[PDB]
Write a protein that binds this ligand. Structure first.
Ligand SMILES: *Cc1ccc(-n2ccnc2-c2ccccc2)c2ccccc12
Ligand SMILES: *Cc1ccc(-n2ccnc2-c2ccccc2)c2ccccc12
Ligand SMILES: [Ca+2]
Ligand SMILES: [Ca+2]
Ligand SMILES: [Ca+2]
Ligand SMILES: [Ca+2]
Ligand SMILES: [Cl-]
Ligand SMILES: [Cl-]
Ligand code: NA
Ligand code: NA
Lengths: 7, 228, 228, 7
């Protein structure tokens, strides 16, 4: 559900 | 399997596989490049990370679909196929951790490279922890926490608060706190202090660095909005 | 590799792999189901088609990216990696054609199953033709044309003009004409007469069949708009 | 470029 690092 | 290909050819083919969205190929090429034994450049480290992130990302998404079906059910087929996907995911994580341990981390002396690899080590132990259920889950979690913590210590001492790898590390450690360690207050505090300290350092940046940092700051903001 | 798993378990796991968007797994499960030697139901045929369509679809997209890079360039790396992807694609096509030949088509007696498999045979020879360049391209093209033609003959004799498999077959044969056989007028004529004859048969359909047929008619219309 | 059958 939460955002980890992504491009 | 890549031992007979030139290092530079593996790197060139990794970039071609990214353009073709062939991330399994991309990861195999970068694994071969690492196994040449030379340190990786900034660009090469990014290629390694993107490849395995996309491979394991698809495995994680598939595992979550199957785990949800399995829970709704609770024949052996759903459990069997979830286990198969889970085993493949664990194999990819073990492969990445093996590359970091043999011998990327021990040869990484600069802050940028050492923090980058310790962040990866935390991430792939975090992915192992997402599927852990036996007597090794606590040690896996502590292995993730320990790698993240060492990376945080180095980044705070050696990098400005807007550095993209420092921001991405703090982002992912905060997700670890929220999702894995059952420490949502720690997750929220980390995300807020990281955002605030980066906000106060933006005035030092070029237009291009500014865009890089604020993009990751928005991910910290997205999580804070979800969590509060 | 699937010889020790029950047919029904392979089918159940194919459906789970589709939900997980694990199309390589899905195709391996359905290959195992076919190799049990029993005929396939309507639903099982659809599972087989969806799995290999998605696997080869990703390979085709990757091949086109690499072929375009290769043409812009004209080191050996781009050609080598295009060849690797191309060889893997050809292997998947050969595997599908082998399943159709051993022994799906020869045991298919009903129009729905026989047309379905002949359409598949045309499609996978079409995919082989997309990458063919040597002394076998003409025979590959004729192999696609021959399979499509036999399916068209059966569908026109045995099926109503709105039948979804008849419409999808005509759609794909018309793309074959346009893209492979360099016969754009034949492609346009086929697409138009297929659309018009289906339009005149819609009044016989239920609301649910109506939606099924008009969805594929719109693909025929999209192509006619692109081609004229 | 043209559409073949798709879901
Ligand atoms: C984990 C992580 C975090 C941030 C980046 N990133 C985003 C924009 N630039 C960068 C970066 C550039 C150069 C060195 C380190 C980071 C990132 C990029 C690639 C892989 C992981 C990343
Ligand atoms: C090639 C092709 C064409 C059409 C269908 N399709 C769409 C909607 N329903 C159907 C269908 C249902 C039952 C039997 C045959 C077709 C299609 C579906 C699956 C695979 C290929 C298809
Ligand atoms: Ca060399
Ligand atoms: Ca060093
Ligand atoms: Ca049996
Ligand atoms: Ca039969
Ligand atoms: Cl399984
Ligand atoms: Cl190659
Ligand atoms: Na579910
Ligand atoms: Na190109």
């Amino acid at each position: 559900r939460p955002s980890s690092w992504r491009q | 399997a890549m031992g007979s290909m030139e290092r530079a050819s593996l790197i060139q083919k990794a970039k071609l596989a990214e353009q073709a969205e062939r991330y399994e190929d991309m990861a195999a090429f970068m694994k071969g490049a690492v196994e040449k034994g030379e340190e990786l450049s900034c660009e090469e480290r990014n290629l390694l990370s993107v490849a395995y992130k996309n491979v394991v990302g698809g495995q994680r998404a598939a595992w979550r679909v199957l785990s949800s079906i399995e829970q709704k059910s609770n024949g052996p087929e759903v459990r069997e196929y979830r286990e198969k996907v889970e085993t493949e995911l664990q194999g990819v994580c073990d492969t990445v951790l093996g590359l970091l341990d043999s011998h990327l981390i021990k040869e990484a002396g600069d802050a940028e490279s050492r923090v980058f690899y310790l962040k990866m080590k935390g991430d792939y132990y975090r992915y192992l922890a997402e599927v852990a259920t036996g007597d090794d889950k606590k040690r896996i979690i502590d292995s993730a926490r320990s790698a993240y913590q060492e990376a945080m210590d180095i980044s705070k001492k050696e990098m400005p608060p807007t550095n993209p790898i420092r921001l991405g590390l703090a982002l992912n450690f905060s997700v670890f706190h929220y999702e894995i360690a059952n420490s949502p207050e720690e997750a929220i505090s980390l995300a807020k202090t990281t955002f605030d300290e980066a906000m106060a350092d933006l005035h030092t940046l070029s237009e291009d660095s500014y865009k890089d940092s604020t993009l990751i700051m928005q991910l910290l903001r997205d999580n804070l909005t979800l969590w509060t």
